[PDB]
Amino acid sequence: PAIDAGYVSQVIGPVVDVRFDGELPSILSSLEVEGHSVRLVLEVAQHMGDNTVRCIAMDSTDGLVRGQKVVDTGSPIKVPVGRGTLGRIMNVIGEPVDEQGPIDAADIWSIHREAPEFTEQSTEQEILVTGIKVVDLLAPYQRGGKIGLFGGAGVGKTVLIMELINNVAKAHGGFSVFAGVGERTREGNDLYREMIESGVIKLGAERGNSKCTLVYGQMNEPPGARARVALTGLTVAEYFRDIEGQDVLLFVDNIFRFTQANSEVSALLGRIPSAVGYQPTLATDLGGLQERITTTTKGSITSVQAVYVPADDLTDPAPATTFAHLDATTVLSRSIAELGIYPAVDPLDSTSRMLNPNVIGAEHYNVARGVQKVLQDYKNLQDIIAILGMDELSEEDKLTVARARKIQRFLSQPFQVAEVFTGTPGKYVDLADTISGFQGVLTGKYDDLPEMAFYMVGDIKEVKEKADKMAKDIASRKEADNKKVSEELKDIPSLDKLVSEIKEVVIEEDDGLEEDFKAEALSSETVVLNEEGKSVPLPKKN
Amino acid sequence: ADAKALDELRKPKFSSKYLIQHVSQKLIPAVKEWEKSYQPPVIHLGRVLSVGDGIARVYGLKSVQAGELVCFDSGVKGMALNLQADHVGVVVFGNDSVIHQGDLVYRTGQIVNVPIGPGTLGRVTDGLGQPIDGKGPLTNVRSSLVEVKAPGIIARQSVREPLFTGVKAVDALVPIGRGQRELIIGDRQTGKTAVAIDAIIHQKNCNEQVPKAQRVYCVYVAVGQKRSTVAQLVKLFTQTGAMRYTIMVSATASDAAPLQFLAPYSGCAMAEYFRDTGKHGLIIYDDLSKQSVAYRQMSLLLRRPPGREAFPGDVFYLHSRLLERAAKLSKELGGGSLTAFPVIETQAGDVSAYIATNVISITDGQIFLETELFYKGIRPALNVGLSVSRVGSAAQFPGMKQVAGTLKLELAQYREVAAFAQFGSDLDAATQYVLERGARLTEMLKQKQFAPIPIERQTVAVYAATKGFLDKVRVQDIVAAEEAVISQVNPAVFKILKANGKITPALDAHLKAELRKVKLPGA
Ligand SMILES: Nc1ncnc2c1ncn2[C@@H]1O[C@H](COP(=O)(O)OP(=O)(O)OP(=O)(O)O)[C@@H](O)[C@H]1O
Ligand SMILES: Nc1ncnc2c1ncn2[C@@H]1O[C@H](COP(=O)(O)OP(=O)(O)O)[C@@H](O)[C@H]1O
Ligand SMILES: [Mg+2]
């Protein structure tokens, strides 16, 4: 009971040192703390050298004393996995945070493992149809690929990752795992409630018919919980890939938060800071996590990860390291969003391994490379269009600017998850309709229509449907003069008659503030504790 | 010198005691003659080893909790940040010039806490809950921790209730849900507090008209602000009557940086009393960009490594764990809410800064205040194209939702055709309709300070502007025409719009009729 039970040596924020009098725990082992108000587990990060381990707290350390008994569990953080975890919300350490009872665990897997070996890799490229025009054309996603959405705080990474849950994750017949790493709690509850009303999450005795399991480590958590909850989300997704052997959809919101939470911790682990104040181990911490999110020869994981860029800076140490880990990078820009184009995808900064003539066909490939050639030559003109205007352009170059403003608006589309605040209903556009639509604007079949006919429309049938509505309303602007439903007698009571139908509200005038409130007696003096732990007023010297 | 070699020095290996017993009969006489030069030994109390930079290193304190209120013998509070093996480093909530090496540090036994309750309503406190308004101590109150964890996913619901700001540009275009966070971001001198003051004055007008459960109890937190501005604000709240529902937490620019770092958590804990008891809170963190500068000071003086803008790296968690406590609670937790309005000061319109982009990725929307619209007299200078409120949308006033869908629409085209006509030489006369309706609606949306408008008198004024009834007035008398619309129209039509919530077709006809007998000043 004494040995293999260490005591808290020192507490520095999220970092706890525990001294074990004998039999130190291994690195990555989890350690329970006895006598804390909540369950505080500590993952061993380092052996410090004098029978001391340095640990990372997965909860808050406010309330830790430097003698507190710490029990080693002999294993890493082990979370429940299986088909019984579906329809549940877990935290970093596998506890259910949805009040639906204990989790029916098929197995209890530790969240730490190595990547699949080089012999385990699968090299197969089939396309993932998302129904998004700019995605399916320019940077098409892979059905077992790693997908990164790169964003700069408000450009639309969460709306885009919520549309991919709407479009892809229902036609895809496998399981989904949503790892929420350091995001808003409201979004988590909103996504939890929009899956129950969609039947993706079923509550009660029908829980086994759920298709999504949620792991949430949101931005109110301490930096130890947000640095490890991505590993809890992989472990649930890796059980469905390795043991169950099926195709998993893994959605990680704000993958950069895992890097940021290790950077809040690395300062306190006594490490010299790397470039931009990041932890020196930035590429291998992210590397050891991302190399687990793959498709093996036994199962598949299609991973979509929202990546937040810190100060709209794509050359920052944490976005720049993530770019090498992804098969398809959808870079969302702020200047594209300020032109009203949603999704705010940079067409000349988004890239897919999938965009190869052999992989997607030569008709699809030549449209995407022709769309990018027009948008790049238009970007080369914008220094002169700003200064000299379009009057000084050659008319070969005016046809470039006219076509590129058309395809810039045509890459945007309304989302079925964005209609709750935009009003425009969302359009799923098939892949054959984006290749057909953008090829017509490149050859010149739609130079007749104006620019705003292409803005927020599904396919090229709807540009022509909107060019008429725009044309039709350039004639009709009036003729609402008389013959109304708004005259005196027809449907309308008296105005003073309507006032009596108002139900009067009784205002209780007393504010209801002292209903159940207990008021503790604040003393006239600062009450402190003396050397014997007794509640004593503050003595009189200084 | 391995550890296997030093624990051999536990067991005795001398077999010769000719000076173990020699000094044992001379040690206690030697210690006794130096007793007035010994400070008394310290185990459960603390003694200051070193003080400086607003951080004290305290010997002793064997049983302090991490993050606990410690009290120096000078009467100053501290918080035990890092417990180390040899000392405990505390951060001093006050002036470190009154702490000396050798001073006793006492334990309060409680993690850092502020008085919360009904008796803190009406008062001006500091960043630690001690009242600075001079009218006594805080009675009818109890202590609660300032670092409470935010409610989780299952303890929340979506925002439904509409929490009227009283600002015309806000409640029409970026409406605020009742458990929502909304960033007020803009440059210096752009009416940042003006939007947050008009939200607080407006709840005083509405609390006396709602039945005791829809009342909003505001909390204003000032971090890094001058004391005179804070004192001029308590005078404004006292004379408008808004101080009855408002708590005023103040950590001014002369205060210590740990008092300014803690003041939004102190004020959030006081506003969490109303969230956790089924009432509704409103909190304003005025210059949360000044709270990050105070936390940057404490992290650099603790020699923590600089960051992107020399910020600690955990400066996101500084604001994220703060603003996550502004939630709309579920029905089993009482149904209470807390609405946050953080304020971020922006340098020269650059919203791609570190602290600006952090709070944008925390909060639910933004209220962008443009410094070029503020210089043109368009006040509140709401950047309509960039200001977002999607959580508060589909939670707003139902009658305002009918009339402001076209207001955002006719302003979306107005920014399109003002971008197309940067100079006047080309006149299309179909876009001059948009230039005459867009300049009409901009003059409708600007309002003057410290006079928030009820939502039923604000729906009618946009009803009178998105539709006809104001194309007579050129652009100048529209502010005079709006008060001509509001005063001359029968005030019994404002009671129907308020009680029904929306514009019924019985009222749509009557309000088209009452808007034709308005004496417009532009004739
Ligand atoms: N709607 C308005 N109409 C007229 N004046 C206004 C309006 N809103 C604010 N002002 C005035 O403009 C000035 C700046 O506004 P305010 O102080 O609210 O801005 P702020 O963003 O808090 O600026 P600071 O960085 O100085 O705190 C003040 O004198 C204020 O009274
Ligand atoms: N696809 C979209 N359609 C319409 N508006 C959008 C879209 N994406 C983002 N927005 C707007 O920009 C905001 C940012 O979206 P969100 O994905 O939540 O942000 P972030 O990318 O910073 O996580 C939304 O609240 C909305 O106002
Ligand atoms: Mg987001």
Ligand SMILES: [Mg+2]
């Ligand atoms: Mg101000």
